[PDB]
UniProtKB/Swiss-Prot annotation:
It comes from Homo sapiens (Human). Signal peptide: none annotated. The active site is at C215 (phosphocysteine intermediate). The modification Cysteine sulfenic acid (-SOH) is found at C215. It is a peripheral membrane protein. The modification N-acetylmethionine is found at M1. Expressed in keratinocytes (at protein level). This is Tyrosine-protein phosphatase non-receptor type 1. The chain holds residues 1 to 282 of 435 of the full protein. Oxidized on Cys-215; the Cys-SOH formed in response to redox signaling reacts with the alpha-amido of the following residue to form a sulfenamide cross-link, triggering a conformational change that inhibits substrate binding and activity. The active site can be restored by reduction. Ser-50 is the major site of phosphorylation as compared to Ser-242 and Ser-243. Activated by phosphorylation at Ser-50.
């Protein structure tokens, strides 16, 4: 079926939970043996969210190459993404090592450091220009260059220096600051505006490594971001845009990381975002 009318048909019939459970039943199951090794317990935020072995990002290190991060490669859309958990106190240096080694231009952050009164991720970037951060375990230096605070999101320019080679690179930090502590946003307008700002920066384009996107577990809000982006790109590429099937795209993405889209409300919000976004594109 088309999207917008399939949408009204699920709303009128109140069957979002049944649609979402079908997706959960059909989703791929691949091994995640490296994630579950005992030496990696303090590298995982949640025991039930792990990268598959076949798509996990490897650190260029011979001691321990593990990070909780997955490469999502979308062949028809010609777009790749790295989805990862919010960094932990003992993985902030690994996080920036990955950004460096994978040649990423942008980092997309969809959570606040504290939500619901608890810490959802480490403070992994500097907050003042004159107070830079040094990650001694991976030999990197990170400096805040500039910050632009807007009503729904903040953009930061950062400098990452590989202290071993003295090479430097400019990284863009796109921080969506207004996702509510409970539920999903009422309108997708500010989320789409944010997606378009990431696109306009070059961070999603083939001349760079894949964008790094995270929330707390790296599957829920993060899944919504890449699912909406890929669906909108396919609608632009194809002769028949009404042939884009959001459930099929989601199942394809779940071949590369488990659990993408965590609730039936997030599924409904993804439909809403693609539907409204397709009108603005034209
Ligand atoms: C302080 O950060 C910035 O504002 C910034 C600085 C340097 C390069 C890029 C930047 O972000 C963007 C600007 C404009 C659009 N449309 C998207 C992204």
């Amino acid at each position: 079926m088309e999207m917008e009318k399939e949408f009204e048909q699920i709303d009128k019939s109140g069957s979002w939970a049944a649609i979402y459970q079908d997706i959960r039943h059909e989703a791929s199951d691949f091994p995640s043996r490296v994630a579950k090794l005992p030496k990696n317990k303090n590298r995982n935020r949640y025991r039930d969210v792990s990268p598959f072995d076949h798509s996990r990002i490897k650190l260029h290190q011979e001691d321990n190459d593990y990070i909780n991060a997955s490469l999502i490669k979308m062949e028809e859309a010609q777009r790749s993404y790295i989805l990862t958990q919010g960094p932990l106190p003992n993985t902030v240096g690994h996080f920036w090592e990955m950004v460096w080694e994978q040649k990423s231009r942008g980092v997309v952050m969809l959570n606040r450091v504290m939500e619901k009164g608890s810490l959802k991720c480490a403070q992994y970037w500097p907050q003042k220009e004159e107070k830079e951060m040094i990650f001694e375990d991976t030999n990197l230096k990170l400096t805040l260059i500039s910050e632009d605070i807007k009503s729904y999101y903040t953009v930061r320019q950062l400098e990452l220096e590989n202290l071993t080679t003295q090479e430097t690179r400019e990284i863009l930090h796109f921080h969506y600051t207004t996702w509510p502590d409970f539920g999903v946003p009422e309108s997708p307008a500010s989320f789409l505006n944010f997606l378009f700002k990431v696109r306009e920066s070059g961070s999603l384009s083939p001349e760079h490594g894949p964008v790094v996107v995270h929330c707390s577990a790296g599957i829920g809000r993060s899944g919504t971001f890449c699912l909406a982006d890929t669906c909108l790109l396919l609608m632009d590429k194809r002769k028949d845009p009404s042939s884009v099937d959001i459930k099929k795209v989601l199942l394809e993405m779940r071949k590369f990381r488990m659990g993408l889209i965590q609730t039936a409300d997030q599924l409904r919000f993804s439909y809403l975002a693609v539907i409204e976004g397709a009108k603005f594109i034209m």
